[PDB]
Design a protein around this ligand. Structure first.
Ligand SMILES: CO[C@H]1CC2=CC(=O)O[C@H](C2)[C@H](C)[C@@H](OC)C[C@H](OC)/C=C/[C@H](C)[C@@H](OC)C[C@@H](OC)/C=C/[C@H](C)[C@@H]([C@@H](C)[C@@H](OC)[C@@H](C)CCC(=O)[C@H](C)[C@@H](C/C=C/N(C)C=O)OC)OC(=O)/C=C/C=C(\C)C1
Ligand SMILES: Nc1ncnc2c1ncn2[C@@H]1O[C@H](COP(=O)(O)OP(=O)(O)OP(=O)(O)O)[C@@H](O)[C@H]1O
Ligand SMILES: [Ca+2]
Ligand SMILES: [Ca+2]
Length: 363
């Protein structure tokens, strides 16, 4: 009876056992079916590698599960293939997006008990789990993944739904933009294989400039910011100002034609929707989570930008844990293992005697 933790993301599923330091399984949130072994369906890395003979579907869009048949296949693959577990033997903690609809969390609960016959289950908000992994119960999380970005203020352990901000700009948009600007440089990154290559470039060589203009001027007048990158076939290319122009989009979404406030502004706006009494607690506990917060320099830039927006007397701290690609998962692991959490699981009996809407009371 070890609990399972499944963190379901737009781009990647992170899954494993409560008490482990990291998820054992990290794989793409993709289900593929034949166009014309062969097997009836494929999930994860195998679906991506065999994509030329498959139609791919992405059942989590901007953090929200939108296809239940495909999501069932993802969970089945997680349990049976990746973790090699019988879900009927393990309490299972799932994660969900901030502002996940009531009907959605009901269907998650239904499927876990009825399809997978789990003995117990819980559904927790991703950003809240990341805050827990940072060792606190009060703060404001910026969670940015492959498909969605949220600001989530949290007080005494619970998210404050009225102040949550959602922005449909995240890692996939940054990858697409890097493809575009490397192509404008004189290269050609346009195909699906080239998307995977550019994602690798983004993850290895991009960074957030402390000051965009200073960095552009450095790049214009020297080769000091230029890095080499070797493609799979051996050709070597040069990346220059694209390294920081790509993640700059988070702070200035207009670079890709979005009129949204940038991540510093949405952080400020979210704090200002909260009760005035807790705002200082939020400013002093800005926690970054998700893969799209991984850029070197992001914390210092956030500190600078929030300082410029906040009152002059305000103490501001940005916490950017090294583990933040997996901090939602870690939060789930430590929560599921915690003595005081054990009474909070929805049990199989509780489900049988209430149905899926028990999720609103217990979660
Ligand atoms: C080495 O592993 C760590 C890696 C890590 C990941 C990360 O993302 O962040 C870093 C660490 C982090 C920045 C860190 O870095 C070095 C610094 C952090 O600074 C304070 C230090 C953390 C220590 C690791 C931790 O030592 C155990 C310090 C400790 O200090 C006293 C903190 C303890 C917190 C009390 C504890 C809480 C938050 C955690 O408890 C396990 C929560 C799960 C409690 C949740 C809770 O009380 C809610 C409100 C209640 C009800 C549920 C409400 N829900 C679900 C609402 O939505 O749950 C029952 O928090 C912890 O015990 C946190 C433990 C974290 C780990 C074991 C992860
Ligand atoms: N070192 C890195 N630098 C920049 N981006 C990174 C880095 N590592 C991972 N990423 C990006 O992070 C994203 C994946 O992060 P994450 O697992 O948090 O998202 P997700 O949970 O799948 O999606 P979402 O939370 O949006 O639903 C991808 O876009 C990936 O390219
Ligand atoms: Ca996520
Ligand atoms: Ca703008």
């Amino acid at each position: 009876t070890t609990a399972l933790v499944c963190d379901n993301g737009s781009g990647l599923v992170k899954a494993g056992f409560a008490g482990d330091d990291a998820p054992r399984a990290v794989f793409p949130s993709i289900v593929g079916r034949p166009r014309h072994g062969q097997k009836d369906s494929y999930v994860g890395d195998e679906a991506q590698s065999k994509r030329g003979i498959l139609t791919l579907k992405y059942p989590i869009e901007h953090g929200i599960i939108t296809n239940w048949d495909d999501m069932e296949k993802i969970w089945h693959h997680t349990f049976y293939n990746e973790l090699r577990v019988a879900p009927e033997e393990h309490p299972t903690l799932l994660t969900e997006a901030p502002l996940n609809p009531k009907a959605n969390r009901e269907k998650m609960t239904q499927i876990m008990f009825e399809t997978f016959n789990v003995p117990a289950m819980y559904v927790a908000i991703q950003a809240v789990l990341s805050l827990y992994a940072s060792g606190r119960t009060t703060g404001i999380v910026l969670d940015s993944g492959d498909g969605v970005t949220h600001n989530v203020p949290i007080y005494e352990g619970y998210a404050l739904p009225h102040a949550i901000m959602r922005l449909d700009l995240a890692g996939r948009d940054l990858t697409d933009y890097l493809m575009k600007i490397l192509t404008e440089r004189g290269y050609s990154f346009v195909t699906t294989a080239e998307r995977e290559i550019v994602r690798d470039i983004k993850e290895k060589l991009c960074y957030v400039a402390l000051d965009f203009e200073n960095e552009m001027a450095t790049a214009a007048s020297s080769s000091s910011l230029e890095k080499s990158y070797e493609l799979p076939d051996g050709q070597v290319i040069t990346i220059g100002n694209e390294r920081f122009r790509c993640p700059e989009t988070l702070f200035q979404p207009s670079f890709i034609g979005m009129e949204s406030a940038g991540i510093h502004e949405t952080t400020y706006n979210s704090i200002m929707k909260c009760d005035i009494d807790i705002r200082k607690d939020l400013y002093a506990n800005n926690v970054m989570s998700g893969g799209t917060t991984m850029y070197p320099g992001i914390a210092d830039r956030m500190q600078k930008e929030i300082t410029a927006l906040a009152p002059s007397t305000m103490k501001i701290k940005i916490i950017a844990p090294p583990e933040r690609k997996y901090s939602v998962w870690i939060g789930g692991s430590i929560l599921a293992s915690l003595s005081t959490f054990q009474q909070m699981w929805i049990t199989k009996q509780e489900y049988d005697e209430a149905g899926p809407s028990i999720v609103h009371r217990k979660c």
